[PDB]
């Protein structure tokens, strides 16, 4: 059955508090990067 995404990274790279976290951890960055 169709559903909207349970995980939504839209505009994640514009939350300044998250910027340092994504730069700290390559694992987190690779899921959050745009496709």
């Amino acid at each position: 059955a169709f559903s909207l995404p349970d995980i939504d990274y839209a505009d994640i790279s514009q939350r300044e508090q998250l910027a340092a976290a994504l730069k700290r951890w390559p694992l987190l960055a690779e899921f959050a990067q745009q496709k």
Binding site: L4, I7, I12, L18, L22, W25, L27, A32
Partner: protein, 243 residues
């Protein structure tokens, strides 16, 4: 309502939370049946059932006996249905029994129709077996249990959660930067995440060694208070039946 609890990974706290949530719901005046669907049969030990008590719903069913005779009373408002003790050969060859337990599903549906219980809680393994899938399909709601760590973060991107499940954090630590980074990211991206969580708490490590649910063991523990919050959330949001 029938409520399933299932870990996104082993060891995240699913069974301790199931026992604790059942205790909180019965304390709030609900009639509760708690069912262990995990073949390791650990839930019963949070309710002071003897380790050498071998009986349970699956044990009875596989022995050709009556699963309805395997229930235990814990309080006037909380009954327990252990899985039962499996032999090593049954443990090592689960394909031989995982398709022989379908009758528990029709039985639980009939028990739900009776209205004897306001809540039926099911502790579920994550093994993709036939019986696990069938039990999940009769749940009205489900909780997917996680810890905030890189393993669970990866798993949420590659495995299925039960349909309609919400995610419940357990084992939340004080003073971990990588944990805070994952958590802050989840708050902005994980649409299924519940607004409350359960902290790491020595009471949750001790209560099984004391053979009690956490809220009975130490009612003023932070984890006990957090479980009570979860119980009240379930009453408000998870009381509806699936259509």
């Amino acid at each position: 309502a029938v409520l399933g609890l299932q870990g996104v990974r082993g060891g995240v706290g699913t069974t301790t939370i199931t026992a604790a949530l059942a205790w909180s719901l019965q304390m709030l005046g609900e009639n509760v049946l708690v069912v262990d669907a995990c073949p390791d049969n650990l839930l019963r030990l949070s309710f002071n059932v003897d380790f050498t008590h071998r009986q349970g719903w699956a044990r009875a069913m596989l022995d050709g006996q009556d699963w309805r005779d395997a229930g235990l009373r814990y309080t006037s408002q909380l009954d327990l249905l252990p899985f039962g003790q499996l032999s090593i050969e049954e443990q090592e060859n689960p394909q031989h029994w995982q398709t022989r337990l379908s009758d528990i599903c029709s039985g639980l549906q009939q028990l739900k129709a009776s209205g004897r219980y306001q809540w039926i809680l099911i502790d579920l393994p994550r093994d993709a077996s036939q019986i696990t899938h069938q039990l999940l399909s009769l749940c009205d709601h489900s909780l997917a249990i996680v810890n905030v760590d890189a393993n669970c973060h990866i798993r949420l991107h590659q495995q299925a959660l039960p349909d309609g499940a919400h995610i419940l954090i357990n084992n939340f630590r004080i003073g971990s930067q990588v944990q805070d980074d994952i958590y802050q990211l989840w708050l902005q991206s994980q649409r299924r995440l519940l607004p409350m969580l359960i902290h790491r708490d020595e009471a949750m490590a001790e209560c099984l060694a004391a053979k009690q649910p956490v809220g009975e063991y130490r009612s003023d523990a932070l984890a006990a208070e957090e479980i009570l919050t979860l119980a009240n959330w379930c009453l408000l949001n998870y009381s509806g039946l699936k259509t």
